[PDB]
Amino acid sequence: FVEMVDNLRGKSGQGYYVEMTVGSPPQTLNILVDTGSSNFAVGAAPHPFLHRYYQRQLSSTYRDLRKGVYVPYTQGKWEGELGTDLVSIPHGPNVTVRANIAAITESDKFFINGSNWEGILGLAYAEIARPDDSLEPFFDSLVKQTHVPNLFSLQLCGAGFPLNQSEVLASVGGSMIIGGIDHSLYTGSLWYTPIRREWYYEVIIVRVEINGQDLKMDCKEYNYDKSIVDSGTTNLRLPKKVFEAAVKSIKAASSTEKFPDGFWLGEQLVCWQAGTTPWNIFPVISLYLMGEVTNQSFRITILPQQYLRPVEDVATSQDDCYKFAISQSSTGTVMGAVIMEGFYVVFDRARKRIGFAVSACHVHDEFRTAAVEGPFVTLDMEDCGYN
Numbered sequence: 293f294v295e296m297v298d299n300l301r302g303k304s305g306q307g308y309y310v311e312m313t314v315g316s317p318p319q320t321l322n323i324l325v326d327t328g329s330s331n332f333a334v335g336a337a338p339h340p341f342l343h344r345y346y347q348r349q350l351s352s353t354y355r356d357l358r359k360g361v362y363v364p365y366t367q368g369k370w371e372g373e374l375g376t377d378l379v380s381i382p383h384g385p386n387v388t389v390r391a392n393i394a395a396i397t398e399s400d401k402f403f404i405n406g407s408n409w410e411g412i413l414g415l416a417y418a419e420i421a422r423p424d425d426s427l428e429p430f431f432d433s434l435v436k437q438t439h440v441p442n443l444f445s446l447q448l449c450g451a452g453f454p455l456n457q458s459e460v461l462a463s464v465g466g467s468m469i470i471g472g473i474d475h476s477l478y479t480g481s482l483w484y485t486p487i488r489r490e491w492y493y494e495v496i497i498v499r500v501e502i503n504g505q506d507l508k509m510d511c512k513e514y515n516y517d518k519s520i521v522d523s524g525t526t527n528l529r530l531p532k533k534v535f536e537a538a539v540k541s542i543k544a545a546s547s548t549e550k551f552p553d554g555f556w557l558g559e560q561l562v563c564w565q566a567g568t569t570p571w572n573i574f575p576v577i578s579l580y581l582m583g584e585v586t587n588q589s590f591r592i593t594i595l596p597q598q599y600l601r602p603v604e605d606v607a608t609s610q611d612d613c614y615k616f617a618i619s620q621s622s623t624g625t626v627m628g629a630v631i632m633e634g635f636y637v638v639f640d641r642a643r644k645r646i647g648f649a650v651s652a653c654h655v656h657d658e659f660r661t662a663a664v665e666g667p668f669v670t671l672d673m674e675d676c677g678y679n
């Protein structure tokens with residue numbers, strides 16, 4: 293899968309994107325890779341944050357579905373016009389598919405300034421596609437029309453430090469392998485957690501540790517009202533109760549240093565003298581996920597290098613600065629880009645499971661590394677899921 297290695301660019305804050313072509317002749321667009329949604333949607337009209345957009349009138353293969361679509365979120369929203377066109381992925385499988393495309397005509401806080409992507413590739417299942425589950429998502433179309441195996445995998449590579457506009461454009465962001473697993477992208481073993489339901493990529497968290505210390509919450513809280521793998525969201529998002537317990541413990545473990553309280557809101561940055569970030573004072577976070585063998589679980593361990601997102605100082609000084617990349621959630625546990633940066637994540641749709649391995653490009657120090665370890669004997673795991 294050498295052709296697909298290095299096909300991603302971007303960063304956790306603005307999202308990771310792949311190059312795609314739509315229409316005839318091919319119109320090149322950069323497309324956000326998103327496991328948290330199910331629509332293939334592209335800018336179709338001028339916008340302050342877009343350098344280019346989809347022009348339907350210039351595509352001979354465009355087909356008008358004569359139907360509108362409105363896609364709200366909590367943080368932003370877009371609306372547009374449904375249609376189909378020919379779509380291909382230059383640095384992907386060597387194929388061309390007829391797929392549904394939402395031509396974005398109006399949007400509010402959906403696009404991101406300087407992100408360098410002009411559309412979204414919703415990789416999740418039809419049930420959450422808008423307007424309804426009848427609008428086939430891109431990947432379902434891809435599998436039906438070709439011989440690409442029903443599987444894709446993601447290696448998102450955080451830099452570990454801020455990248456300027458030129459650097460993010462020149463730098464490789466990672467790899468999306470379509471139809472397979474590239475073994476050079478990870479170390480150690482792949483551990484599989486089952487997909488509970490095919491809508492989002494829903495998983496079940498059975499136990500949570502901070503510096504090996506059990507959070508001792510009823511596991512149903514960890515998955516209230518769901519737990520999802522979501523590459524289109526920046527942060528780890530945790531349900532109110534879990535978030536508060538986690539922040540209380542992270543605060544405690546890192547007490548020897550004190551932070552403005554707006555830091556824990558993810559609003560303000562904390563800075564240290566160049567190279568002196570006290571990584572060691574921050575605790576590791578372990579999430580135990582349901583396993584494939586009955587009564588068996590495994591854990592993924594995340595370092596502060598994952599939950600502290602590098603941002604360049606307003607001072608643009610010599611200092612190394614970070615934002616707290618864990619957010620309070622009202623829509624469940626959301627494993628965002630900052631968590632995925634630590635891992636090679638296999639979306640094995642054909643076997644209804646998600647794999648986790650230590651990423652070959654994960655950021656660490658000399659004393660600690662991210663881990664994916666197992667097995668652990670765990671009981672009643674099924675009732676950790678919310679109904």
Ligand SMILES: COc1ccc(-c2nsc(C)c2C(=O)NC(=N)NCc2cc(C)c(NC(C)=O)c(Cl)c2)cc1
Pocket residue numbers: 306307324326327328329365366367368369401402403404492520522523524525529623624626
């Ligand atoms: C910060 O507050 C938040 C509150 C809730 C969640 C959330 N909780 S659960 C779940 C499934 C999601 C989710 O929306 N996942 C997803 N892939 N969404 C699509 C997508 C991608 C982009 C890049 C934008 N644009 C900007 C500026 O963020 C927009 Cl609008 C939507 C995420 C962030």
